[PDB]
Amino acid sequence: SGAIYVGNYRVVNRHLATHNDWANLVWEDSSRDLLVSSTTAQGCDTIARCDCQTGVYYCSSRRKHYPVSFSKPSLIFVEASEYYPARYQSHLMLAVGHSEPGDCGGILRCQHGVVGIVSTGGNGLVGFADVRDLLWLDE
Ligand SMILES: NC(=O)[C@H]1CCCN(C(=O)[C@H](c2ccccc2)n2cccn2)C1
Numbered sequence: 001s002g003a004i005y006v007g008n009y010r011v012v013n014r015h016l017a018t019h020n021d022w023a024n025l026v027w028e029d030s031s032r033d034l035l036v037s038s039t040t041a042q043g044c045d046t047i048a049r050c051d052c053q054t055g056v057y058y059c060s061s062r063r064k065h066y067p068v069s070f071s072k073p074s075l076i077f078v079e080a081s082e083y084y085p086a087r088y089q090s091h092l093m094l095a096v097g098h099s100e101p102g103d104c105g106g107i108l109r110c111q112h113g114v115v116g117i118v119s120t121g122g123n124g125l126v127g128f129a130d131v132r133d134l135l136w137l138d139e
């Protein structure tokens with residue numbers, strides 16, 4: 001679990017969005033596993049606007065942060081799960097690191113701010129849904 005709070009927006013994994021997220025929906029994209037909802041309180045986070053390919057993410061299943069090298073956002077095949085059919089997920093970045101069910105939502109940050117959230121895992125890999133292209137989160 002986990003979310004990004006920026007301005008009057010809450011960014012979560014679409015597959016973990018709550019009834020309240022859907023009732024306050026701003027934008028969602030099943031192909032990216034992202035959903036953004038509106039909030040009444042001002043957020044605590046700021047978003048990176050950069051091309052960093054290294055950073056640090058939070059891994060809830062280890063209660064620890066780990067440094068990673070990750071690929072640029074791209075279209076990657078993701079196997080069928082309880083939440084989605086087999087499909088290509090867009091804007092996804094892979095890295096070598098620990099991620100198991102329950103780790104989705106952990107934040108990946110670089111020196112410029114929040115880069116994205118954990119969205120996939122297994123096999124010693126971790127995938128992050130990028131948010132750096134969502135320029136409207138900042139206004
Ligand atoms: N973006 C998606 O389509 C995700 C939706 C939820 C299922 N997905 C996973 O990767 C997870 C998982 C999560 C976090 C670390 C490891 C595994 N999972 C694999 C097998 C069983 N669960 C894919």
Ligand SMILES: [Zn+2]
Binds near residue numbers: 112
């Ligand atoms: Zn950066």
